[PDB]
Structure formats: C-alpha cells, structure tokens
C-alpha cells in the first residue's frame, strides 16, 4: 500500500510540479491580456478573443 | 470419472516468485514497464496535463462572452431609458397573425 | 544491441501515432470539400486582406 | 472523427504485431494516448456544435461520452490481465481485438450525424459484446446471459429500423442537423402512437427500463470484468443518448406517451433499489444499482426540460465511472476467493486497509454525496421532476434513503466485522489493482472542479 | 452454495401460476403503477388547468 | 474589510492544512495529534479577530470568491456568510474542539489509528464550518451531508463490533429521511424564487412558505434528533467518547436547529410552522428527559440530556426567539 | 425499374453512353476498401491452410489484391452509371411533366401559423 | 466441486425424497 | 475601474468617524496597524513587481462582435441555410438574456446584504427591476422545453399576441 502511494505521488508530481511552475512564470512574466476595442479595419484572429496566455495558445494551435 | 479431464489448477500467488511484483506480469522486467506506462501515461500525462488543458479551455461554450455582452446591453439600454429586456423576442412589425 | 532487436520489436510504436497524423490529414482534406460558403455567410463575410487569399483552410 | 477512428483501428495491428509479452503494455500505452487526444473534442461553441463532415459531428452531449468511452479501454485492459494470464496467446489477442472493435463502433456511434448510420453502429456493438460474455465469462449462465442480452435488444431495435426508414421516406432525410430544422409536430393518431413506441422501445430496453431489465442482471453479472465495465459504463448510455436525439422528432406526442414510462421508472427506482437490500451476490447487487440509477435518466429525458437534460448527461457520466469502479472493486475480491457471494469474505478492512478506502469512496459516490457529480446530476433531476409534479419528491426521496442503505450495507458486509477464519489467501493489494481504482475515482472527483463539461448541450 | 442457489436459480422452476401467486403479482406489480399514474395525471391535469386560466403563481419561475 | 475578510478565511484554510500535509506526506508521524491540536488553537485566535470587529461595530460581509457553475439563470458561487451566526459559533466550536482534541490525545493514546482519528475529527470540523458559513443552500448541503458521513465513520470507529456498524448505519438512515425535507426546500426555492442564495430568498420573502419550511423542519427533525427521528442520537454513543463530546453533544446535533435559525426571516412571518416546531420540540424535551430518569449507562444519560436541550432549542424557535435558540447553542 | 429503359442496350455491362461519365479515380476510397478485402482474403487463405499468415505466398496475396481491385473498378463504373441513368430519367420525366411537379408557394415563418405546445 | 445431486430441488412428495432432502441439508428427517 | 459602475452600482460609502468614550485601548486599532505592516505591505511589493513585468509585455484581447442577420420570421419554410443563421443568432441572444437576468439578480442580492435590517424598504427599486426582467424573460423563454428553438419561441410569441388581441376586443366591448 505504501509503495503504491509513493508511486502515485511521484508520477503526479513528475508533471504536476513542472506544470505548476510553468503556470506561475507565465502569469508573472507574460501576464494576461488587456481588454481593448477592435482597431478600425483590423480583423482579429479567432485566438485573439481570449484573455489568458494558455487559452490563446490552445485555440491557436489545436482548435 | 466420466472423462479424462485435467484437475482444477490451484491459483498461483504472484508474490511467491516475485515479492516486488506489481501484479501486471510474471516477468519482472515486463512487470515493471507495464507499471511505468500506466502511471506515466495515466497519471503524469492524461490526468495532470488533461486537467490543465481543461482548466484553460478557450471560453467553453462562450459563457464569459455572454456575460461581457450582457454588460454592454444593460449599460446601453439603461443609459437610453430602454427596457432592460423586452417581452417580445421578435419585433412584431414583421409577424402576420392568422386572422 | 544497435539498430537490431531494438528496431524489430519497437517499430510498432509508430502505428498509432502515425494513424493520428494520417487521420488528422484526412480531416483537413475533408474541409477542402466543404468550402461552398467560405467567406460567404451573412455573419462572417468580409473583404479579404491584401495578402490573405482565403479566410480559412 | 478520422483522427480518432484511424488510431483506434491501428491498435489492432499493434496488438497482433507486438511481442508476445508486450501485448498488454503496448495496447495499454497507446490506448491512453488516444484518450489524451480525445480532449480536443472539447472545442465546443455556445450556438453551433462541431460538424466535422457529412458523416460525423460532435456536440456537448456526445463529447463527454466520447471521452469516457476512450478512457475506459485502457482501464479494461488493466482489469483483464490477471484472469487472462493462463490463456492462449492468440486468444488473448482476440479478446483485445473485441475490445478495440467495441471502442471503434462506440466512437462512431456517438458522433454519427445520420440516424441510420447511428442505427448500424448502435447495433454493431452487440457482436463484440456478445462474444466477450459468452467466450470469456466464467460460469455456465454466460450462454443464457448472451441470449437474453441479444434478443432483448433486437426485439426493440428492429421496429426502430422500420420507424427510421419510414421517417426518411416522409421527411426526406435522417441527418440530425436537417431534422432540427425540418422537424414537424406529431399529430395525435394511432399511427403516430406506434411510431413513438418504435422510436423509443429500443433505447428503453437498453437503458434498461424497469420491466425490460431482466437481461441486465444476467449479462452484467456473467460477463468478464472488462465486459461488465463497458456494459454498465458506456453501453447503457447508448439508450439514453438515443432518446436525447430521437425525442427531437416526437413532439408533442411525448407529453402524454411518457406517462407509462415515467411511472415504470419512478416505481422501478424503488423496486430495484430494494432488491439490492437482499442480494446475496455482490456483483448482482451492483448490477441492480445501475437499473435504479438509469431510472432517473429515463424520467429526466422524458419530461424534456433544460434542467432534466443537464442532470441526465451528468448522471450518465457520473454513473459510468462509479459502476465501473464498483465492478473492479468486486472483481478484486473475486480474484482472491473465486466466489461472488457477498457474505463469504468479511472483515476485509483488517486485511486490505487501502482497498477499503476505495470501497468507501466508491460507496460515497454511489449514494450521491455532495458535491460529487453523482449528486449534481441526481439533484438536477430531482429539481426538474419537482416542477413536473411536486408529488414526485416523495418517490425521489424514498430512493435516496434506500440507496444509502444498500450502498453502506455492501461496504459494511464485505469490509467491516470479523474476518472469515478459513480464508487465508487474501494477498496484499497489487499495484495494478490500486492504480485501477485511482484511475476511476480521481477523474470522478476532479470533474467536480469543472462540472460544466459534462452538463450537455443545454448548458 | 445451496442458499444462494435456492434464492436465485431455484425460484422459477418451483413456481406455479396459481391464484395465490397471480393475485400477489397483480396487486404488487401492477397496482402501484396504476395508483401512481392517477396521482400524477390528476396532479398535472389540475396544474395545467390553473396555468391556462392564469391563476397559478409563476412570477419568478424561470427555471424548469 | 481588508482584515475582516482575510482573517475570516485564514481560519477555514488553517484547518485544512493538516489534511493536505497528510496527503502528500509533507509531515512527520507521531506528532500529528499535537499538530492537529495546534491548528485548532491558532484557528481559534484568528477567528476571534473578526468576532471582535463584529462586537465593536456589528460588521458583517459576504464573500463570493469563486464562480463555480452557472445553470442558465442560476449562478452558483462559493460564498461565505460572515454574520451574527458565524462570528459567534466558529470561536465557540474551535474553543470546544480545542479541548476535545487535547483530551483525545490522552483518551485515545493507545489506539493504533490515533492519526486517522485526528484526521476524521478535523474533517468533521471543516464540514461543520462549511455548513455554518454557507450563504447558499447547495454549499449548505455539502457540509450538511459531510457531517453525516464523518459521523458515520466515527460512530463505527471500532468497526469489528457489530453494534458499532448498526449504530453507524442507523444515524445515516434517520438523517437521510431528514434530507428529504432539505431536498424539498431546495426544489421549492428554485421553482418559486429562482435562487438558492439566502439573500434573494429573504429579499423576495415568500408569503406562501408552508411547503419549504415544512421541509426545513423535517430536515431539522432528523439531524437534531427530534421526536420521530430521535433514536439515532442515543445509539451514537457506540463511538469513542471524544466523538460523542464533539459531534453528538455540542457541535453536530445543533445543525438542525442552526438551519432553522438561518431561516428566521421566513419563520417569523409563518405562525403555522411556529405551532409545529413548538409542539415538535415540546414533546422531544419531555420524552427524552423522561427516558434519562432511569438509564444506567453514563453516556446514554448525557446523550438523552442533549436531546432534551435540543428540544428546548426548538421550543425556542417555536416561540419566535431565534436569537435565544442560538445563544443556547453556544452556551 | 429500369429494365425496359428505352435506351437500355440490353445485356451490356457498360453501354457506350457510360463513357460520358468520369471514371472512378484510382485512389477512390471505395476502390481501396475493395483492395483491402482482397488482402483479408489472402490472409485467410494462409490461415485455413496453416501457413505463416503474413509472410507465406506473397505472390498469391498480390494476386488476391489485384483481382479484387480489377473487378471492383468495373463494378464501380457500372454503379456510377446506373445512378447517372436514374437521375437522367428522373429529371427528363419532370421536365416533360411540369404540371406534376409545380413549385409550391413558399412562405415565411412570420406568416405561417404553427401551434405552440408548452413543455411544463 | 458440487453436483446437481446436492443442490436444492423441487418440493418433496414421497417419503423417500423427504429423507433424501434431509440427508442433503444435513438435518435429521424429523427436523426437516 | 476594474468593472463598470453603471452596470454594478455601489451607493456612496458613509463611514461613521471614531468617537471613543473609554480609556482602554481598542484592540482592532492595534491589530489593523499590525496587519498593514505585516500583511498589506509585503503583498503590495509582490504585486507591484508582478505588475511591472506585465507592462514590459503588454498585449491585447478583443470582444467578439456579431453583426445582425435576418431572424427566423424572415426565413422561408424548410430553408435550412437561412434558418441556420437565424437559429444560431437566437441561441446567442438566449444566452445573453440569461446573463442579463443574472446581473439584475446580483443587484438584488447585493442590495439586500448592503442595506442590512432596512433592506425591505431600501431595496424596493432593485426588487422592481428584478420583477420586470423576470417577466420579460419568462415570456420569451419559458415552457419551450429541452428542444427549444427559434421556431418554438416564435410560435409562443404568436400565441401570446393572439391572446392579447383577443383581449383588446373584449376590453373595448362596452
Ligand atoms: C491547485 C494546485 C495547482 C496550482 C497550479 C499553480 C497555480 C499557482 C501559481 C499561479 O497561478 O500564479 C500565481 C500568481 C499569478 O499572477 P496573477 O496575476 O495573480 O494571476 C494571473 C491570472 O489573473 C490568474 O491566473 P490563473 O487563471 O492561471 O489561475 C491560477 C490558478 C489558481 O488556482 C490556484 O492554485 C490558487 C487559487 C487559490 C488562491 C488561494 C485562495 C484560497 C481560498 C480559500 C477559501 C477558503 C477555503 C476554506 C474551506 O488556477 C490554475 O492554475 C488552475 C489550473 C491548474 C490546476 C489544474 C486542475 C487541478 C487542480 C488541483 C486538483 C487537486 O503569481 C503569484 O505568485 C502572486 C504572488 C502570490 C503570493 C503572495 C505572497 C505575498 C507575501 C510576500 C512576502 C514576501 C515579500 C518579499 C518581497
Ligand atoms: C515562451 C513564451 C514566448 C512568448 O513570449 O509568447 C507570448 C505569448 C503571448 O500571447 P500571444 O498569443 O498574444 O502571442 C503572440 C502571438 N504569436 C505567438 C502567435 C505571435 O504567449 C505564449 O506564447 C506563451 C504562453 C502560451 C504557450 C505556453 C503554454 C503551454 C502550456 C504549458 C503549461 C505549463 C507548463 C509549461
Ligand atoms: C482540493 C482542490 C482545491 C482547489 C484547487 C484550486 C484549483 C481548482 O480547483 O480549480 C482549477 C480548475 C478549475 O478552476 P476554474 O474553472 O475556476 O478556473 C481555472 C483557470 N481560469 C480562471 C483561467 C479558467 O480545475 C479544473 O478545471 C479541473 C478540470 C477537471 C479535469 C477532469 C478531466 C481530467 C482527466 C481527463 C479525462 C479522463 C477521464 C474521463 C472521464 C470522463 C470525462 C467526461
Ligand atoms: C451464369 C448464371 C449464373 C448467374 C445468374 C445467377 C445470379 C442472378 C443475378 C444475375 C446478375 C445480376 C443481373 C444484372 C447483371 O449485372 O448482369 C447482366 C449485365 C447487365 O445487363 P442487363 O441490363 O441486360 O441485365 C439483365 C438482367 N436483369 C434483368 C436482372 C437486369 O450484363 C452484363 O454485364 C454481361 C454482358 C456481357 C456478357 C459477357
Ligand atoms: C422492445 C422489446 C420489448 C419486448 C422484449 C421481450 C423479451 C424478448 C423475448 C425473449 C428473448 C428470448 C430469451 C432467450 C430464450 C431462451 O434462451 O430459451 C432457452 C430454451 C432452453 O432450451 P435450449 O437452450 O434450446 O436447449 C439447450 C440448453 N442448453 O430454449 C427454448 O425453449 C427455445 C426458444 C426459442 C425461441 C427463442 C428465440 C426467439 C426469440 C424472439 C421471439 C421470436 C419472434 C416472435 C415470433 C414471431 C411470430 C411467429
Ligand atoms: C408484445 C407484442 C406487441 C406487438 C405490438 C405490435 C404492434 C403493431 C402495430 C402495427 C403498425 C402500425 C402501422 O402500420 O404504422 C402506422 C402507419 C401505417 O400507415 P401509413 O401509411 O404509414 O400512414 C401514414 C403514411 N404517410 O405508419 C406510420 O405512420 C409510421 C409507423 C412506423 C412505426 C414502426 C413500425 C410499426 C410499429 C412497430 C411496432 C411498434 C411497437 C414496438 C414494440 C417493440 C417491442
Ligand atoms: C413489464 C413490461 C414493461 C414494458 C411495458 C411496455 C410499455 C407500455 C406500453 C405502452 C403504452 C402506451 C399507450 C398506448 C395507447 C394509446 C395511448 C393514448 O393514446 O392516450 C391518449 C390519452 C389522451 O391524452 P390526455 O391524457 O387526455 O391529455 C392530452 C390530450 N391531448 O392520454 C392518455 O391516455 C395518457 C397516456 C396513455 C395512458 C397511460 C396509462 C398508464 C397506466 C399505468 C401504466 C403502468 C405500466 C403498465 C405496464 C404493465 C407491465
Ligand atoms: C391481471 C388481472 C387478473 C388477476 C387474477 C389472475 C387470474 C386468476 O386469479 O386466476 C388464477 C389462475 C388459475 O389458477 P388455479 O385455478 O388456482 O390453478 C391452475 C393454475 N394454472 O391462475 C393461472 O393459472 C394463470 C394466471 C395468469 C395470470 C397472469 C396475470 C397476473 C400476473 C401478474 C401481473 C404481471 C406482473 C406485472 C409486473 C410489472 C411490473 C413489475
Ligand atoms: C456553491 C458550492 C460550491 C461547491 C464547490 C465545489 C468544491 C470545490 C472545492 C473547493 C475549491 C476551492 C477553490 C478556491 C480557489 C478558487 C479557484 C481559483 O482560484 O480559480 C481562479 C480564480 C477563479 O476565477 P473565476 O473567473 O471566478 O472562475 C470561473 C470558473 N468558472 O481566479 C483567479 O485568477 C485567482 C487565481 C490567481 C491568484 C492566485 C494567487 C495565489 C497563488 C499562490 C498560492 C498558490
Ligand atoms: C459479390 C460480387 C461478386 C462479383 C463477381 C464478379 C462479377 C463481376 C465481374 C466484373 C469484372 C469485369 C471485367 C472487365 C469487363 C470488361 O472488360 O468488359 C468486357 C465485358 C463485356 O463488356 P460490354 O459491356 O458487353 O461492352 C459492350 C460495349 N458495347 O465485360 C463483361 O462481360 C463483364 C461481365 C461480368 C459478369 C456480369 C456481372 C455483373 C453483375 C455483378 C454481379 C455481382 C453484384 C454484387 C452486388 C452486391 C451489392 C453489395
Ligand atoms: C520519459 C520520462 O519522463 O521518464 C519518466 C518515467 C519513469 O521514471 P523513472 O526515472 O524510471 O522513475 C520512475 C519509476 N520507478 C519509481 C520505478 C523508478 O518514464 C516512464 O517510465 C515512461 C514510460 C516509458 C516510455 C516513455 C516514452 C515517452 C514518449
Ligand atoms: Zn483468480
């Protein structure tokens, strides 16, 4: 029982810590987007209608 | 006897020949790698990155946009004395009643 | 060993990944047959940009 | 949907071209990757669904079912490694091929845009399911279970085939997008009364509806563990999914045709939940719990309200992970004592301390402890039915009391008390078994943090 | 093994459709279904009449 | 407000730290009972700061920090109500829980699972603070049902004993029959007021509130062990003595009374319910007191004593004195 | 139905007018599925005679695939021809019986009356 | 292994079967 | 600042001034000073550092605007292409109208908390605005069913209009 819980803890933290750290750096050094009016004659791309950096990357790359 | 049939084999304890067995396979090398794939792809990839992927969905089903849009309409309609919400969804200027 | 018994019993680890790439490609080819209303709908029709030639692929 | 169909098909060459001792490792690893890519279907919009091509489309209803379906294949492979260890290699690889075929048919079933295409795939899931039950089940009764599971589904599905073909001849199409706009009201006549029965009986038998459920305690009990998991987690939800779609083209006749089935389900809730209080077989008690949980889904779908539909979708996903978990927990005991009787092995909490924790969590989800998605779905269905008729709260309330009694009775009867003296082969829980439970309960609880992705189109 | 078999698999072959079993299965099986049907049809028929007449309070009822 | 809000949430967050540390194993064993006891102590001093700010100038606030779910026109957000019946109960519960945890270090010293015992006592305390601070019914339902589950796991602590499991399941049985009323109230408010938030329920102030209040009274009947659903509380003495002192004497069986107190803005305008609650409490305070006159088990005498005092709490709610019923909970 | 078609050209696999239609592309998805059936036939041939399923008789397997693709190609030319003839007859009949297929007067949903059935 | 000869059967009619049932259930025929 | 005050009004904040009438020190006064020094100041330093980095990499996101398209009343029967665009428009409006009801409910809930024991009289305007938006929402979106559509909403509207026209005649009958 203890071996399983150690393995379960290790593998959740194997990517849990890098992801937790990565999200922290992005929020500080990249930050969110500011709500702005659409410039005249400018057509935003479909991934420019979202705030968070990670959400804009999911939409730009996958959707 | 009524036939020539093998005896009911006794169940095999996987811990007898391998007290470090993870339960996946009799071969220790195969047993360890089956445990590694399940834990890495199961917990490190799908549950950790999948949960992170879902948490940052691009406005699932446009409910943040809906709140943002309603704020404009409430601001606009109230600033002009218009009703906050009309009781007719379609303008009755282009509806022809039966008789 | 080297490129033997590690390419004869691990080459199968490209079938499913390759199936995803092939499946992804066919979906892109499927959208190419459904472009009868690209930049022609009442809600998203607009003038093309100077360099843009198609609104979406 | 070719980005998911093709990789699933490639799981077959992988199994057959893999090393003899790597069939489980290879298939498990790549089925978890296909599960990973299934999250891309979450690209849903608040007005329009994903319409990939002329054949396949995904909306907020099919997407959670697709993700659940593709997530269960790795779990089924883990759960089957033990009891298939002393099996011929070719027959081990044929068992996996049936599981892959079942996923291939299920993913095409939930995304089919044309109803007749849905029918064929909806019907094709019987063959691999029938083969798993009758070939790799343990007891004699697997043969009779297969016949019941087969002829109950075809006795209702064949009239559905006639009704669907009739609809195309009169409406001109069976594309589900077209029907949304060309649908017409159903005039009240004897002819339409039977078009309603033909369009709904197949899905109710598969739900199952109380009275037509006799196939479920046989099939779900006599099947191997992998069969039971898919049977209770994804294949009961073909009926619920079908009714959600087909009910679009049955208005307004559904508002009075629904009474005999709302009554069977509401009263069937209490009967099936009560049967569990006196079940001697542990695996059979879990089987009857599904009948009682799918009773709420039938009622929610038939009363046709946004809250009932949101509850129905959450219930189907929540029940999928909980019933599947319970079968695996029950099979964990069976693989040690080789008997399904609930009272045979007792006090197992003193011998398997960590497996008793999974029993607790699986029991708390089953009895709908808030804020688990089991309670969210069940609550949303109680709220909607109260508006339908305030008296229904009585029947819904009584079932909640019975549900807690047989959920904790199962926990107390098998885990607490004194251990059986003559059972001395209770070996410590394997890492495979523990990881199998963690792969059920962790997603079930993480969904509480973001419930909206399982609330369906009406969200 | 005799107790579980006696409770599950030995029930049907030792059943005879006689007066005792037919009446018990009729009033316990069909009886509740008919009873609840009229409790709900009456309740919904009464409610629908009030809603059409406009004399049922639904002032803030916008969740169904 | 900057300090009132921050210190009102630190109390709740402080209590969850020992639970979290015991998950990722970021702590050392054999100090856990002492670790958990020290968490309650610091949770008590921090909780006194917001209480003083209330005593000073009667400051109250509602914190809706997390938006969880939006079902069309029903927005569910994690909301905490820091008001009269949250700034006075939390300090009292933490002070009493402080003593019971210290007493448990001695009473349960020889128990091999003393670490699990202090995890369950702490989990119960969290679910009770969720119940007491809940600003909407759904969140109130989380702590309402959570306290029942932790009661079930603590009544049957000595799970090898058959009579312990029977008492544990009996508590669930009577509290489920009470939950039928809780679900009935939630259904009525949603259909008739389109909300589960107490604020909107009070603002609209329904006039025909016989149905929702009868559901709440039924919910209070079970969890507070009033007549008809009383037997479980005396039989909850199967668990270890610390459980009886904490849960089934002072800080769990008062939840039913606390639920009716939170809805005094409705029950003060409904004299039909006041008649029912007054009579329900009056029979309870008499019947259970009469039972204690001849019981020889010391724990059951004090168990029936709690039911009698709980009955006197509901008699107070029946005479339209919600604030005297609350003050009797604390004392 | 179309047995007595005026220009039937009886007992001809592909009448001459069928050469006015696009031939199936050699990358046709239907033609690839037919080729796949030939591959399965080759494998089953080895399996029933207890030969190495994937390796034995590559020459035999190639002829299985070739034979299916060859016959499939012509069975798809006639499939497309017969559906081409159906549409040709269907439209010519409509064009010569205009009074049987009159365009109905389409109205807008603001005009047509549809009864409302409340769901409560 | 367990055979059909030692599983519950139909109601016993003749006194020969009553004794067999009692011997099958490990009861004395007077107690069966 | 962060949110518009026209859509989420907050009345002016009247705070009574301190007027001690005792010699004992006020514990809240000293705890407030400790909180500011130990809690509020280190927190601000972290935020200002974070806020400084955002300015160095400032970028923008926009609010999607949908141009109006012909509604279902202007689509021909069984015309999928025109009905499609009308339907997707009616769904977006349905969602927006759902959030409009949410906003007015937040006003009602916030007013009741803010006014304390005098909310009965001091939140009469918020209550009235909630009783009118709810009426309008119920008229155009209630009883439609799980399979709601623009067609069903249009049919519901035309049934209400016939009932109102049939009421005008019976009103002007004397
Ligand atoms: C959960 C565990 C996983 C967490 C993952 C990492 C997230 C945390 C890192 C982060 O988000 O950036 C934080 C933050 C990001 O900047 P930001 O501008 O504030 O946020 C950016 C966006 O606005 C908002 O950014 P966001 O939208 O990305 O939200 C961040 C986060 C938010 O979620 C959080 O982790 C934190 C939110 C809770 C905050 C604590 C409030 C708790 C409320 C208690 C309520 C009472 C409960 C009682 C019961 O949300 C997520 O990350 C969710 C996705 C990841 C999880 C996937 C699903 C699994 C969940 C876990 C299952 C178990 O950066 C900072 O570090 C701020 C400083 C905070 C420390 C203050 C210290 C002050 C004292 C200084 C003294 C020394 C002075 C020296 C000079
Ligand atoms: C590297 C950052 C480069 C950069 O400055 O781009 C800024 C942009 C700012 O947003 P943006 O969308 O406006 O970027 C400009 C548009 N492009 C890039 C197309 C020119 O954001 C990023 O690209 C970085 C954040 C998203 C990608 C990383 C998230 C992946 C998920 C990781 C989970 C945590 C583990 C790590
Ligand atoms: C104890 C937890 C304390 C709270 C922790 C704080 C963080 C938090 O809770 O919120 C973060 C988030 C929610 O927070 P949020 O929604 O409020 O905001 C997140 C960040 N922003 C603001 C940018 C949106 O948690 C999640 O979203 C978890 C998502 C659940 C993922 C479940 C699926 C993962 C597995 C893949 C599928 C495989 C299983 C298949 C099952 C069938 C599926 C249909
Ligand atoms: C030889 C006897 C065994 C075959 C008969 C048993 C099978 C019955 C079905 C016959 C095939 C279907 C008939 C249509 C067809 O494609 O064949 C005739 C086809 C189609 O020509 P057809 O239009 O005249 O078809 C006549 C048959 N019926 C009435 C059914 C339509 O002719 C050929 O392609 C062969 C001509 C070249 C001869 C070499
Ligand atoms: C919506 C749907 C709602 C209505 C659903 C109703 C339920 C479906 C009908 C029940 C399905 C049949 C259950 C299986 C029956 C069965 O297995 O009987 C077994 C019985 C035992 O004998 P046997 O097995 O053959 O001997 C070897 C023993 N090892 O063998 C027999 O006695 C022979 C039984 C043969 C008949 C079974 C096959 C037909 C089942 C469908 C009915 C046929 C169609 C109706 C007739 C058309 C009109 C003529
Ligand atoms: C226990 C055994 C019980 C067995 C019950 C058998 C019931 C048989 C009912 C006869 C079928 C009724 C029928 O003919 O359909 C009605 C109608 C026929 O006339 P039609 O020309 O289509 O009128 C409109 C044309 N524009 O056609 C229609 O309008 C469409 C109806 C098609 C519906 C599917 C086929 C008929 C119904 C199948 C049986 C329904 C009951 C399903 C129960 C499953 C078990
Ligand atoms: C164990 C087997 C389990 C499987 C069972 C198979 C499913 C049940 C069989 C389907 C029965 C469907 C009924 C078909 C007959 C025709 C129904 C009909 O036309 O009724 C119309 C009638 C008029 O409508 P009205 O209620 O007045 O209000 C609306 C007016 N426009 O409105 C009505 O009459 C109301 C609706 C029909 C009458 C309902 C009466 C229900 C009685 C209790 C049913 C309990 C279940 C019985 C199953 C026994 C087994
Ligand atoms: C329905 C109304 C009829 C209820 C009365 C049943 C008929 C009856 O009472 O007559 C008894 C009849 C003869 O029995 P007997 O004369 O004693 O001896 C010969 C044995 N065949 O008994 C018989 O022999 C045959 C009786 C068959 C009756 C079948 C109908 C009753 C079955 C219960 C209803 C079905 C349960 C539905 C449950 C659905 C939801 C769970
Ligand atoms: C009604 C009953 C409710 C039932 C609840 C069900 C059970 C839930 C279990 C308890 C969960 C408690 C979570 C409390 C924290 C809230 C989570 C969070 O912070 O998410 C990010 C936060 C939320 O923003 P919001 O837009 O309101 O979310 C909308 C989601 N639909 O917005 C933010 O950006 C804040 C995060 C950034 C600031 C973090 C700074 C500290 C980081 C360092 C410490 C770690
Ligand atoms: C199951 C499928 C089994 C199929 C078995 C093989 C049968 C199909 C064989 C087709 C292969 C054709 C070979 C090449 C033919 C060719 O080159 O043409 C020459 C010859 C005559 O051509 P002709 O049309 O007369 O040209 C006259 C021009 N003035 O062309 C011929 O004479 C070819 C005549 C072929 C024999 C007639 C068969 C046609 C009907 C197909 C039967 C199978 C249909 C199966 C449908 C199942 C649907 C799922
Ligand atoms: C990689 C990585 O991130 O590897 C980390 C982990 C292994 O972790 P480990 O270092 O073996 O320790 C953990 C194991 N224990 C505790 C027994 C020592 O990968 C795996 O096993 C992943 C499965 C192998 C195939 C990966 C293919 C990736 C594409
Ligand atoms: Zn075994």
From Swiss-Prot, chain A:
| Membrane-spanning parts | 10-30
| UniProt subcellular location | Mitochondrion inner membrane
Q: How does it assemble?
A: Complex I is composed of 45 different subunits.
General function of this protein: Accessory subunit of the mitochondrial membrane respiratory chain NADH dehydrogenase (Complex I), that is believed not to be involved in catalysis. Complex I functions in the transfer of electrons from NADH to the respiratory chain. The immediate electron acceptor for the enzyme is believed to be ubiquinone.
Family to which this protein belongs: Belongs to the complex I NDUFB5 subunit family.
Name of the protein this chain belongs to: NADH dehydrogenase [ubiquinone] 1 beta subcomplex subunit 5, mitochondrial
Its lineage reads: Eukaryota, Metazoa, Chordata, Craniata, Vertebrata
Q: Which gene encodes it?
A: NDUFB5
From Swiss-Prot, chain C:
Q: Where are the transmembrane segments?
A: 10-26
Q: Sorted alphabetically, which InterPro entries does this protein's record hold?
A: NDUB1
Q: Which UniProt keywords apply?
A: Electron transport, Membrane, Mitochondrion, Mitochondrion inner membrane, Respiratory chain, Transmembrane, Transmembrane helix, Transport
Topology of the protein relative to the lipid bilayer: Single-pass membrane protein
Taking the first listed entry, what is the main subcellular location of this protein, grouped into a coarse class?
mitochondrion
List the subcellular locations.
Mitochondrion inner membrane
Q: What does this protein do?
A: Accessory subunit of the mitochondrial membrane respiratory chain NADH dehydrogenase (Complex I) that is believed not to be involved in catalysis. Complex I functions in the transfer of electrons from NADH to the respiratory chain. The immediate electron acceptor for the enzyme is believed to be ubiquinone.
Gene name on record? Answer: NDUFB1
Query: What protein does this entry describe?
Result: NADH dehydrogenase [ubiquinone] 1 beta subcomplex subunit 1
Q: Which GO terms describe its cellular component?
A: mitochondrial inner membrane; mitochondrion; respiratory chain complex I
Q: Of which family is this protein a member? A: Belongs to the complex I NDUFB1 subunit family.
- Assembly and oligomerization: Complex I is composed of 45 different subunits.
From Swiss-Prot, chain D:
Keyword Repeat set for record:
no
> Where is this protein found?
Mitochondrion inner membrane
What Pfam families does this protein map onto? Oxidored_q5_N, Proton_antipo_M
Q: Name one GO biological process term.
A: aerobic respiration
Enzyme's top EC category: translocase
Give UniProt keywords alphabetically.
Electron transport, Formylation, Membrane, Mitochondrion, Mitochondrion inner membrane, NAD, Respiratory chain, Translocase, Transmembrane, Transmembrane helix, Transport, Ubiquinone
According to UniProt, the name of this protein is NADH-ubiquinone oxidoreductase chain 4
Source organism per UniProt: Bos taurus (Bovine)
From Swiss-Prot, chain G:
Q: In its keyword annotation, does this UniProt entry include Transport? A: yes
Q: Which domain of life is it from?
A: Eukaryota
| Any single GO BP term | mitochondrial electron transport, NADH to ubiquinone
Tell whether Mitochondrion is among the UniProt keywords. Answer: yes
Transmembrane regions listed in the UniProt entry: 57-76
**Residue numbers bearing the N-acetylmethionine modification:** 1
Disulfide cross-links: none
Q: Which UniProt keywords apply?
A: Acetylation, Electron transport, Membrane, Mitochondrion, Mitochondrion inner membrane, Respiratory chain, Transmembrane, Transmembrane helix, Transport
> Localized where?
Mitochondrion inner membrane
Report the membrane topology from the UniProt record.
Answer: Single-pass membrane protein
Q: Which Pfam families match?
A: NDUF_C2 (PF06374)
UniProt's post-translational modification comment states: There is a minor unacetylated form of subunit B14.5b.
Q: Which family does it belong to?
A: Belongs to the complex I NDUFC2 subunit family.
What is the name listed in the Swiss-Prot or TrEMBL entry for this protein? NADH dehydrogenase [ubiquinone] 1 subunit C2
Q: Which organism is it from?
A: Bos taurus (Bovine)
Q: Gene encoding it?
A: NDUFC2
